[PDB]
Amino acid sequence: SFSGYLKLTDNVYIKNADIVEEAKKVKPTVVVNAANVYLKHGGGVAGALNKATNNAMQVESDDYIATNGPLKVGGSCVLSGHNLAKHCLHVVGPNVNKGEDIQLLKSAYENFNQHEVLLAPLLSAGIFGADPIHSLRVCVDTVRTNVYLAVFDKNLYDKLVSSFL
Numbered sequence: 001s002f003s004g005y006l007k008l009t010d011n012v013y014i015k016n017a018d019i020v021e022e023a024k025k026v027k028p029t030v031v032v033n034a035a036n037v038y039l040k041h042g043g044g045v046a047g048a049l050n051k052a053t054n055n056a057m058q059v060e061s062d063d064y065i066a067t068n069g070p071l072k073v074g075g076s077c078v079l080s081g082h083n084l085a086k087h088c089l090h091v092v093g094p095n096v097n098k099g100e101d102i103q104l105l106k107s108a109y110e111n112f113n114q115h116e117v118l119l120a121p122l123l124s125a126g127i128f129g130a131d132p133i134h135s136l137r138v139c140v141d142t143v144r145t146n147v148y149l150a151v152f153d154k155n156l157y158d159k160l161v162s163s164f165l
């Protein structure tokens, strides 16, 4: 199972780790992808997870979009986890670099409550432009299920832990 995680709350855990390496090690039931509405997995966590699946995640995602149209910002869909997890929960956090409403970050985290346990990144953090300290606070105050957060950046991980209320 999950190892080396620091417990933040009753249900939120955090580790300085690459979510792709973490997924290959643990093979969780659910890995969360930091998706966009088009499921175009170009960069950040999405690009890394997709590259780990040899582009199978992108092929599956394009078929999903062709059938269903784009997701909503704050929404999600469950697709295959390929070689990383049983399932991938593609969650769209607001991209503040695209002028999207940051109030939608709580709606994005609410998707995690449909799964008992998840391996996840901080939503809207990194290339999505939001403050990761704010994302962790919204995560802790929204998610009630067991969430194992993988924070790639060491310096950000230390800042998140040392500033956690």
Ligand SMILES: Cc1n[nH]c(N)c1C#N
Residues within 6 Å of the ligand: 017, 018, 019, 020, 044, 045, 048, 121, 122, 126, 150, 151, 152, 153
């Ligand atoms: C989380 C995570 N895992 N691997 C990455 N490249 C990220 C980011 N950002």
